[PDB]
Design a protein around this nucleic acid. Structure first.
Length: 112
DNA sequence: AATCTATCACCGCAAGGGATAAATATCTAACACCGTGCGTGTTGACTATTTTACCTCTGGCGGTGATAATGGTTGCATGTACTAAGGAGGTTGT
């Protein structure tokens, strides 16, 4: 209850058309349960930082592989999104259309 | 359903055109030979077909970070034309 607002200010970032303007807040409100259970204030650190790690990634996963058509081990989910993040160079440095042939040097790896 | 005279014409019956098939002569193809070289055979040494064993790849997925970060986003459902229903509440009536 004391943290229900911090769940909005983190979650609402990700609700940006992502799947809906709403639902990620309520999944953050369940990530907050694991956070409240493992709240090691006995290290010294603050619940702001706790939320910035754990509750943020509960908010991320709430529509990463949850609510999709498809779901995989998570390294192989967000790696598809590493490529979309890298494409921000491609679309302006090769800079007319995207080319997997450029992505091969930007990943140092074979396409297949 | 038979009779024919009297139509417009097919027959009455001369001509002649193309045709095809005979004989000739040309073509090609079918073959039989030869020669080439390849996929005829076993053997043998190679090296890496497969297996298992061993030593030690790739990628299975589980786990969760802390100088601190603690009031949020979200834009347009719709402007029209109808009108049936429920909702309101004061009151002049039932």
């Amino acid at each position: 209850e004391a943290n229900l607002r911090l769940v909005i200010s983190i979650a609402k970032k990700y609700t940006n058309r992502g799947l809906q303007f709403l639902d990620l807040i309520q999944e953050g409100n369940i990530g907050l349960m694991k956070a409240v259970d493992k709240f090691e204030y006995r290290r010294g650190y603050k619940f702001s930082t706790y939320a910035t790690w754990w509750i943020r990634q509960a908010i991320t996963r709430s529509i990463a592989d949850q609510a999709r058509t498809i779901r995989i081990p998570v390294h192989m989910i967000e790696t598809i999104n590493k490529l979309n993040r890298i494409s921000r160079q491609m679309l302006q440095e090769m800079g007319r259309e995207p080319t997997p042939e450029e992505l091969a040097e930007r990943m140092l790896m074979p396409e297949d």
